[PDB]
Write a protein that binds this ligand. Structure first.
Ligand SMILES: NC(=O)[C@H]1CCN(C(=O)Cc2cc(C(F)(F)F)ccc2Cl)C1
Ligand SMILES: [Zn+2]
Length: 139
């Protein structure tokens, strides 16, 4: 679990969105595993606007943060799970690191701010849904 709070928005993994998230829906994209809902309180997370390929992510299954090198956002085949059939997920970045299903939502940050959230894993890899292209989160 985990979310990004920026301005009047909350960014979560689409497969983990709650009833309140869907009732206050702003935007969702199944192909990216992202959902954005509106909030009443103001968020203070800073979103990175960059092409960094190094950062640190929070891994809840180890209660630790790990530094990683990660790929640029791309269309990657993602194996079937209980939330989606086998499909290509877009805007996904992979790194070598530990991830279990409950780790979805952990934030990946670079020196510029929030880069994305854990969205996939398995085989010693961890995948992050990018949010750096969502320029409207700031306005
Ligand atoms: N973005 C997606 O399609 C998500 C939906 C839920 N997803 C998962 O559970 C995949 C997953 C599997 C494992 C493994 F290998 F241990 F079984 C570890 C971590 C993750 Cl996130 C993908
Ligand atoms: Zn950066």
């Amino acid at each position: 679990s985990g979310a990004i709070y920026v301005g009047n928005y909350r960014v979560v993994n689409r497969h983990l969105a709650t009833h309140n998230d869907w009732a206050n829906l702003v935007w969702e994209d199944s192909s990216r595993d992202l959902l954005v809902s509106s909030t009443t309180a103001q968020g203070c997370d800073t979103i990175a606007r960059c092409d960094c390929q190094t950062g640190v992510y929070y891994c809840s299954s180890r209660r630790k943060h790990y530094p990683v090198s990660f790929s640029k956002p791309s269309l990657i085949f993602v194996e079937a799970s209980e939330y989606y059939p086998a499909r290509y997920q877009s805007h996904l970045m992979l790194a070598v690191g530990h991830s279990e299903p409950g780790d979805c939502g952990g934030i990946l940050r670079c020196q510029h701010g929030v880069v994305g959230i854990v969205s996939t894993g398995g085989n010693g890899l961890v995948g992050f849904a990018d949010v750096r292209d969502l320029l409207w989160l700031d306005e």
